[PDB]
Write a protein that binds this DNA or RNA. Structure first.
Ligand SMILES: Nc1ncnc2c1ncn2[C@@H]1O[C@H](COP(=O)(O)OP(=O)(O)O)[C@@H](O)[C@H]1O
Ligand SMILES: [Mg+2]
Length: 962
RNA sequence: CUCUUUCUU
């Protein structure tokens, strides 16, 4: 079977920009190039995707001697074959971009067939003549980011004049003297602070302390490398601040600190606040999304995630004295972005000091990055830890694989059967029987039971790939007789999309006689510290998001963690007392793990980050990314540039239009930002914002019970006769708002009854409120964002909701599909796909829907391309908002996006299609004058009126029985 | 058949 998967994966969307290079000729061209340049390199099919979903992966690595670069690729696949095709296409496109191969120009082929039957659409005479009048009316057919030392009457964090309080005649010198006197008095009198310094002097970092300061005082860029638990993050900023205060210059110090994760930043800020024996928000503050406590403008340490600093960079960095980047080894997009921006900072302004601190980096690489900068190694760690591997526990608890899986069970190197002959025979058989991709719950239960038998107090930490395995393990352990006793063991998950209360529950102490088992993803990997952690159990798997750009496919892959991730998870233990680190993989597998995971820049879209580049005015995108540490593939850069230019956020000169600036200021996908602005023009910004926020969450609203492959009848009614996920999400959020407003326990019981997710609703509402606030900041009047109650039970027409569903087509372009029966739909160019089990439109019967056109939010690959966040849309909405060009096919059939066929009058088709440039002009004029969107010239008011009349559900149901 | 790595004043 599964020819449909090959047909769907061969699909291409952006072959036009890359010189007509597609899958069908990419492998041939790559083979020809390799033969010509006598390159003997070959694919590295890296099997992944566990075993119930044996996907694969692939990665060539051709080397271009002439230019001296090394053009490389990394792609996903559902069977070696397809991946290799995608990798070859990426490599060929990249090699084309630096002009080493001529653009393709000959011929491909056409199989089409299966052409879909036309869908008749008719419009009422009043609608047509209104469109005619509307058409007649609308006459239709670089600089340097600045820096400055701290100044009087200026706030560093807010970058605004104070003009308030009694801090007007207070100079910097007087403030520094007051700070020095206060610090001396605190040191002399308070005994808790003195005890804290007595503890701090015992840390290894103290032995290096003095010389570290010298480096900071002699070189703008300093790299610090040391073992985990040696006290870098909570000590370096304090050392700098205390030196500045004691040296009579306490008012001239401002030390930013950047943490890779929210919980890490919060925990480190709290620990710094406790170490100075002071309340939060006075000297040390933190600023993460949806939670910010700010310290005094002078002599303060601010902990913020990298994205927060990137958003702060728009206002400039006037008044900062030091910037610290922790966990630089993360290699993600924001870290490298901040690295380039900080290099520019140091080069332009030598007074600013930048300190890079981490535990496991290539010191030579980052030193040569900054044009040779000092690197200081901190020797020694806090306490030693004992490390074990899978075969060690197998010998060390006499575990035997269950007969259960022994038969339930029923050339890639399987390291689980390779081990030293020092160990016993039965241990070797037990190690060999276990598979690699899957995990064993019997193994974990036996290991935890033996740890209990060890009678060593302390928390247990289990690192897991994702939510599914975490909650499956929670359910499995809860059913056990021993671990089900809440008085003996307490199990806490640690996930970013879990409620914030549960995230903070991982730091609070537990009562006597109970052991805390924390099941975490890689959120608990870096820089956090829990006092009672003694045991770290590493499953050695990490999940990443693979994005195939040529077919616009997304997937989640559970791949083996690198050695750096394992070393950091090991370092999470043994910070206050010696412990154990049980790592679950063979010693051969441990030796076979990659050094570091691939950086995010090589496997992520760059449209948002290129837009941010243009916002802060660093210059051309291509040159800026050529200045980056690890240059992203040129094809991704050109795809981002074309995506922004085509959507009109950049003019012909690659400059920033006001729409581009406004979309840059929003924390949303640029397409979602344009869609939100259009929703604001039509006076439906509340629903528009909440719906856009649900389309950038990667979380689920409805929680199908473990296994059930459909929602049910409580949840599948929220959607109501609309048969759309977004209307159901709106109804659920509207009910949940009232339920919370009447009680928090009411919120919990409502979420239990209706089968929702409390954390998903909270994050969606918070993102929607932030979007509304930012839209208000730009000048859009509040009258455009009044909350509109949605009645999903009403069938027929609803202007606001229908125009919202129509604007979805513009916001989720080109994610459109056509349903046939049961769960089978066709995506663009008629590629077969399945409706996901979570979506409310999934059905086991051969039921039919009124309008067979859908727009979905995500296209996830599994063992069958699946779709996510579906919503039904009328043909008129699709024609208006879901295509760029509309043409005329044979026998008078209108063709949309070269794959949709409509039976509609060509004259009226041209009439309706002429409105899209008018809509672009409306967006431009609305973003130009945000305060003047609700009042407009008469032609644009008529345009809005006819668009509202066209976006009705039954606007094209005249004379049709349907 | 596995709905949910991290981040965005
Ligand atoms: N909750 C806590 N209880 C006791 N000690 C702590 C706690 N949090 C942090 N510490 C101590 O503070 C130090 C901070 O180390 P840190 O600089 O975060 O390590 P790294 O340099 O790897 O980030 C650690 O050595 C740890 O012993
Ligand atoms: Mg290394």
């Amino acid at each position: 079977e599964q020819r449909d998967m090959n047909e769907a994966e061969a699909f291409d969307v952006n072959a036009a920009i890359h010189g007509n290079w597609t899958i069908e000729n990419a492998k041939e061209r790559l083979n020809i190039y390799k033969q010509t340049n006598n390159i003997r390199d070959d694919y590295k099919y890296t099997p992944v995707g566990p075993e119930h979903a044996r996907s694969f992966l692939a990665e060539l690595s051709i080397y271009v001697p002439a230019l001296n670069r090394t053009v490389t690729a990394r792609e996903s696949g559902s069977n070696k074959k397809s991946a290799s095709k995608s990798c070859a296409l990426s490599l060929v496109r990249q090699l084309f971009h630096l002009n080493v191969i001529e653009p393709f120009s000959g011929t491909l082929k056409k199989k089409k067939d299966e052409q879909l039957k036309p869908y008749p659409v008719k419009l009422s005479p009043n609608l047509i003549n209104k469109i005619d009048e509307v058409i007649k009316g609308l006459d239709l057919p670089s600089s340097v980011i600045p820096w400055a030392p701290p100044q009087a009457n200026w706030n560093t964090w807010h970058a605004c004049n104070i003009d308030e309080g009694e801090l007007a005649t207070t100079s910097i010198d007087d403030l520094s003297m007051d700070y020095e006197r206060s610090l001396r008095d605190r040191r002399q009198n308070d005994n808790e602070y003195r005890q804290f310094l007595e503890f701090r002097e015992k840390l290894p970092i103290a032995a290096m302390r003095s010389e570290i300061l010298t480096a900071i005082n002699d070189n703008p860029v300093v790299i610090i490398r040391g073992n985990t638990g040696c006290g870098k993050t909570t000590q370096i900023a304090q050392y700098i601040l205390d030196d500045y205060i004691c040296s009579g210059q306490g008012g001239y110090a401002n030390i930013y600190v950047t943490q890779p994760r929210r919980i890490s930043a919060i925990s480190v800020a709290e620990r710094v606040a406790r170490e100075r024996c002071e309340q939060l928000g006075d000297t040390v503050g933190y600023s993460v999304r949806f939670e910010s406590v700010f310290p005094r403008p002078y002599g303060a340490i601010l902990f913020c995630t990298v994205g927060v600093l990137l958003r702060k960079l728009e206002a400039g960095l006037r008044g900062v004295s030091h910037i610290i980047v922790d966990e630089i080894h993360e290699r993600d997009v924001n870290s490298d972005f901040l690295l380039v921006i900080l290099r520019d900072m140091v080069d332009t302004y030598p007074d600013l000091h930048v300190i890079l601190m981490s535990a496991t980096i290539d010191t030579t690489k980052f030193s040569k990055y900054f044009g040779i900068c000092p690197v200081l190694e901190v020797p020694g760690r806090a306490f030693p830890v004992q490390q074990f591997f899978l075969e060690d526990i197998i010998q060390m608890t006499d575990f035997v694989p269950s007969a259960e899986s022994r038969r339930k069970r029923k050339a890639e190197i399987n390291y689980n059967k390779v081990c030293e002959d020092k160990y016993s025979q039965k241990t070797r058989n037990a190690m060999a029987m276990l598979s690699e991709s899957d995990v064993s719950f019997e193994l974990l239960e036996a290991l935890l039971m033996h740890i209990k038998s060890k009678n060593i107090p302390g928390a247990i930490l289990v690192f897991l790939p994702g939510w599914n395995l975490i909650f499956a393990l929670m359910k499995f352990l809860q059913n056990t007789n021993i671990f089900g006793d809440t008085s003996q063991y307490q199990i806490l998950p640690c996930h970013s999309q879990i409620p914030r209360d549960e995230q903070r529950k991982v730091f609070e102490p537990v009562p006597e006689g109970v052991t805390k088992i924390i099941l975490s993803t890689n959120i608990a990997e870096t820089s956090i510290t829990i006092d009672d952690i003694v045991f770290v159990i590493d499953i050695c798997k990490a999940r990443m998001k693979l994005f195939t750009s040529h077919n616009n496919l997304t997937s989640y892959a559970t791949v083996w963690a690198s050695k750096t991730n394992l070393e950091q998870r090991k370092g999470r233990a043994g910070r206050v007392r010696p412990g154990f680190c049980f790592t679950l993989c063979s010693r051969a597998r441990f030796q076979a793990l990659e050094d570091n995971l691939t950086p995010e820049m090589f496997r992520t879209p760059l449209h948002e980050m290129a837009l941010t580049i243009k916002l802060l005015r660093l210059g051309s995108i291509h040159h800026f990314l050529s200045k980056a540490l690890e240059p992203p593939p040129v094809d991704a850069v050109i795809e981002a540039e074309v995506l922004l230019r085509e959507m009109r956020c950049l003019d012909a000169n690659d400059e920033l239009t006001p729409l581009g600036r406004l979309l840059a200021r929003l924390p949303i996908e640029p397409r979602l930002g344009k869609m939100m602005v259009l929703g604001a023009v039509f006076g439906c910004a509340d629903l528009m914002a909440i719906m856009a926020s649900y389309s950038s969450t990667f979380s689920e609203v409805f929680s199908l019970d473990i296994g059930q492959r459909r929602l049910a009848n409580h949840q599948k009614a929220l959607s109501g006769t609309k048969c759309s996920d977004h209307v159901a999400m709106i109804v659920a959020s509207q009910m949940w708002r009232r339920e919370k407003q009447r009680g928090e326990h009411m919120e919990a019981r409502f979420c239990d009854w209706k089968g929702l997710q409390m954390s998903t609703m909270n994050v969606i509402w918070d993102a929607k409120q932030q979007l509304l606030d930012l839209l208000q900041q730009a000048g859009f009047p509040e009258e455009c964002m009044i909350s509109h109650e949605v009645d999903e039970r009403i069938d027929g027409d609803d202007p606001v909701l229908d125009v919202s569903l129509a604007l979805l087509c513009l916001g989720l372009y080109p994610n459109i599909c056509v349903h046939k029966e049961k769960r089978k739909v066709l995506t663009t160019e008629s590629k077969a796909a399945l409706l996901h089990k979570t979506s409310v439109n999934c059905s086991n019967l051969a039921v039919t829907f009124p309008y067979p056109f859908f727009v979905f939010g995500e296209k996830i690959r599994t063992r069958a391309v699946s779709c996510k966040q579906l919503s039904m849309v009328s043909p008129l909405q699709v024609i208006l908002f879901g295509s760029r060009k509309i043409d005329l096919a044979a026998n008078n059939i209108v063709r949309v996006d070269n794959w949709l066929n409509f039976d509609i009058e060509p004259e009226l088709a041209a009439k309706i299609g002429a409105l899209k440039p008018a809509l672009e002009d409306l967006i431009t004029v609305a973003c130009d004058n945000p305060s003047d969107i609700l009042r407009l010239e008469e032609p644009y008011a008529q345009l809005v009126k006819v668009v509202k009349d066209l976006c009705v559900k039954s606007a094209g149901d005249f004379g049709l029985q349907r």
